[PDB]
């Protein structure tokens, strides 16, 4: 490890056209730093390879409003109006990835795996390819997705995906040593440590350099070998993108309540399901930006920077939780370890298809594609019926991008909760009182069966 | 996760037959306690995933002398005569895995990711298939290997391998709190770690329970989402496989040579680690052990010695200041994808275009080949062989194609001998670039297997102050 007293020095020699991977969830584990220092530098033509977009004044927005981005690759771009200005007006490229394979892909590039097989994104936009990457100033498409390819294993869809490599990683750690081991701060750790293995020349900020001895040489979350550079951080904002602290909705929150059991492993979406959290049992919080054990919102002197969840909210967390880094909580969720994912949709069909992630009138499917991609986790939709005019929600075939294909196992809506089987369809199982089959089948777009033990649609006290 | 205070209770419903995941490298990490619980409950044929199969005596080699393994899934047999016996007699069926394959097959039956592409094993009986799984009495092969799938991707040769999972996995751990977090000790953690994520059942035995908030959350190693059963053993005794405590030397003193200031490297067992003792104290280089550590020191002394650190040979190590602790799937990432600088390793046959042979010998030597396909996998990391010139009854070693299995193709950058330093070239072969002083280049070519240029620039061979 080479120590740098002047993040500029640390970073003069990134050409320019370079890939360069940023670490970061939201604004937690930003490397605001080293992303000053490349305004100074003025390099431009970046490839960046960024779970998100920052937000329009800070993070990699920062480095949109100089214009030194050409191409980004993320998974949830929202929150950033110049990125969007920039990428309708056929300014910048965009490859929308799913967070779990952002996450797997950079840990391949760097653990020697050139291509891996994942559930995740079979059967949506991402296998099939020909969504825009880039327009022209027109309106027209300047560049198209391509497709993934498809094997089947153990009688299951996979699709192949390549490793991310950069030419240069800018990641931001919370302390290092003087040997250049280092260790991240909460949730902050999230995509900074794979980044930190998958790029030629890595460059790591920290708040607080260290005496070697001062970790435990189990606890050093980066070894030295990883660490190509490294510099003490000049100054540090603590910037907080959400400051969060402590009828039909109300109907299926509490029904939704009723899906928690003892001991169980949840994640839960934004709106509905985490609101429902608040009705419940010992049950296990899980945050996809690298959390186990999720609290209630903090008192304002429990408000920390380093500690959000993927709805980029300030959070807290329990007595015996857990932080690891994205590549690791991805692999919890895609290996199917979570019991029960809970989320909203704007449409589900008849064998279990799933929309909830792009209205065709552009912000990314985030971890939504690899929340649903195991069949071992259970799939839970909260949602209002039907739309705007009592159009259909649900109904035979989804009409928006799919976020996974059968892989709902129950509905949950403010007049009905429905089982759904990949082969076997719908099941109504249970009934909002005063409400009759009828009217269910009035809101439906496709058949149901009726379980002969329907019951009244039941409510947490 | 579900706390027991019997360790035959927490694995009595494991079935005959059943696949098992064990932790472990060597006796570091081993669940013992777990291991004599199977002893109790008697459960056969059983397909062991381990890296090693312990001691005759001691850990999975137990499970041999029962007679309750069908078939191990293993990287190395290492010092276990009986394991070895087993195999070689017909009575146990061994697939002998890439230890960083093994590592991310692992890994990947934990991740959701059913197969992905390694260079590991290309160019052997890995990919080609044929790797003895069975023998028969008379030491033809019953059951061999089948081959993995080719393909290329960015100008190099990758092969497909597929995701291990367990129907239980028995994995040893330091300490659990009393939510079901877990985290482990110096080296013993190597496989346990991504073992207790590729199972349908975990089984955690762990030497003390403690209270929640004993961690700080950022240092719990294993998240208690994975920790199915937990059990503090009842017994731990510590054992040590291996106490080292605190023409050969020329091959030493050239190859003492080979290091640089700020190298990482990764030296095999013999005369690589024995180059190490003459690294001047003016320069860093920083020693890498497979089994998962970063900052390799001197052998201990007694006061020093500690069951949970070992090096790939397992012997009892020291670490210097600044050290780190890792997994195996990590330091096999850390391998593959060419962190490491220079892997020094020793040889039973080098090709003139830089394929090596160091892992088998048909009908003699079935031990498997460890992490050395892995070692000499990537294209970023220096691969520089140090061996004897010649086998016995002046039987070349450096010749024109391998006789013997390969370990990898075209894979070593220089070759070491007592006689000659060579440069390998795998499109133009061997250049002769030092020669032991006192011996002619004729000495070279009478006993070497093949053709080499010399250089214009030939010196003699050079040697550590
Ligand atoms: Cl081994």
């Excluded at 309540?257 to 419940?280: K, Q, V």
């Amino acid at each position: 490890t080479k120590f740098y007293t002047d993040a500029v020095e640390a970073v003069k020699d990134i050409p320019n056209g370079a890939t360069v991977l940023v670490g970061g969830f939201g604004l937690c584990g930003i490397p605001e730093n080293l992303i000053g220092a490349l305004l100074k530098t003025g390099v431009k033509e970046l490839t960046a390879v960024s779970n998100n977009a920052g937000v329009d004044n800070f993070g990699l927005g920062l480095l949109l409003q100089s214009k030194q981005i050409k191409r980004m690759i993320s998974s949830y771009v929202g929150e950033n109006a110049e990125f969007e200005r920039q990428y309708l007006a056929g300014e910048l490229e965009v490859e929308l990835t799913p967070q779990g394979t952002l996450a797997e892909r950079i840990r391949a590039g760097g653990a020697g795996v050139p291509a891996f097989y994942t559930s995740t994104g079979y059967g949506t936009l991402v296998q099939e390819g020909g969504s825009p990457i880039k327009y022209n100033k027109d309106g027209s498409i300047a560049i198209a997705s391509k497709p993934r390819e498809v094997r089947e294993f153990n009688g299951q869809h996979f699709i192949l995906e390549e490793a991310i490599r950069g030419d240069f990683a800018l990641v931001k750690a919370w302390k290092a040593d003087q040997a250049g081991n280092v260790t991240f701060r909460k949730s902050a750790r999230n995509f900074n440590l794979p980044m930190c293995k998958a790029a030629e020349t890595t460059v790591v900020e920290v708040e607080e350099i260290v005496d070697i001895g001062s970790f435990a040489p189990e606890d050093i979350h980066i070894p030295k070998i990883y660490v190509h550079r490294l510099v003490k951080g000049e100054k540090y904002e603590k910037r907080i993108e959400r400051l969060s602290v402590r009828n039909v909705r109300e109907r299926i929150i509490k029904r939704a309540a009723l899906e928690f059991e003892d001991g169980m492993y949840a994640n839960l979406g934004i709106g509905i399901p985490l609101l429902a959290s608040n009705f419940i049992m010992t049950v296990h919080l899980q945050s996809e930006n690298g959390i186990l054990g999720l609290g209630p919102y903090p008192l304002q002197n429990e408000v920390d920077a380093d500690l959000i969840n993927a709805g980029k909210e300030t959070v807290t967390v329990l007595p015996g939780a857990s932080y690891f880094s994205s590549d690791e909580s991805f692999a919890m969720i895609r290996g199917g370890h979570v019991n029960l994912t809970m989320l909203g949709a704007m449409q589900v069909s008849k064998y279990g298809d799933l929309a909830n992630w792009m209205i065709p009138g552009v912000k990314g499917m985030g971890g939504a594609m690899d929340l649903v991609s195991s069949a071992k986790t259970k799939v839970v939709v909260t949602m209002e019926h039907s739309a705007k005019g009592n159009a259909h929600k649900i109904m035979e075939k989804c009409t928006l991008p799919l976020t996974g294909k059968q892989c709902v196992n129950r509905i949950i809506t403010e007049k009905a909760v429905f089982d759904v089987d990949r082969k076997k369809g719908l099941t109504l199982i249970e009934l909002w009182e005063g409400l009759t089959v009828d009217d269910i089948k009035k809101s439906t777009g496709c058949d149901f069966a009726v379980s002969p033990k329907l019951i009244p649609m039941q409510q947490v006290t």
